[PDB]
Amino acid sequence: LLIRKLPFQRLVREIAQDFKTDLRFQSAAIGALQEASEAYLVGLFEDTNLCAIHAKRVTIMPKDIQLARRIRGER
């Protein structure tokens, strides 16, 4: 688990508070959200590595993250 738990739990709870759900999250549920966040982001960075390589760039830029995102059709 590479993401430190305290700031991540804080963010998750804040997001829940924006949706005004007022429903407690299972600790294992927040853990699953953390693990999935890690896997997601790592796959993202693989796509950004590919994008930067195709751009004749070693350094990956926010553009590479945005393109890796839209190639999957997310927001």
Binding site: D47, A52, H54, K56, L67, R70, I71, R72, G73
Partner: protein
């Protein structure tokens, strides 16, 4: 189960000059027949930062769709450079193929596209205003990104 599966997409005549059309050879399979039309799109991402500069290069309606295998050539004209921000013009972007049934997109096949100058003088000092006549468009066709979505197929 999904009633339509995209078996292959072949990127034809690539690399090509920027103003050349996109030609994809799309082969898909219909498990059980569809009463209404599939809708295919070629989306072009003209700026990574915003969908505003998305250009829809072509949109085709295919239907009714019997069961079995299909192949067709989807071809669309090149994007309009007047709608592409000059800062996003020379470099990497993505192009997309999309299929929609009953208004909901169930598949998106993306590709990374690199628009580049082949001219060594222009590689050295690119023009301030991008020159699209000297831009080669290189689709990366060996790493397609195939994204399946969940969709209501009923009626």
């Amino acid at each position: 189960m999904a009633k339509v599966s995209v078996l292959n997409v072949a990127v034809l005549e690539n690399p090509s000059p920027f103003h050349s059309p996109f030609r994809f050879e799309i082969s898909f399979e219909c498990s059980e027949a569809l009463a209404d039309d599939l809708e295919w799109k070629i989306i072009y991402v003209g700026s990574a930062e915003s969908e505003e500069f998305d250009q829809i290069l072509d949109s085709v309606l295919v239907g009714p769709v019997p069961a079995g295998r299909h192949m067709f050539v989807f071809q669309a004209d090149a994007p309009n450079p007047s709608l592409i921000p000059e800062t996003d013009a020379v470099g990497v972007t993505v192009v997309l193929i999309t299929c929609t049934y009953h208004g909901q997109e169930f598949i998106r096949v993306g590709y990374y596209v690199n628009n580049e100058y082949l001219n060594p003088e222009l590689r050295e000092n690119p023009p301030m205003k991008p020159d699209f006549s000297q831009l080669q468009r290189n689709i990366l066709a060996s790493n397609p990104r195939v994204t399946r979505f969940h969709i209501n197929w009923d009626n």
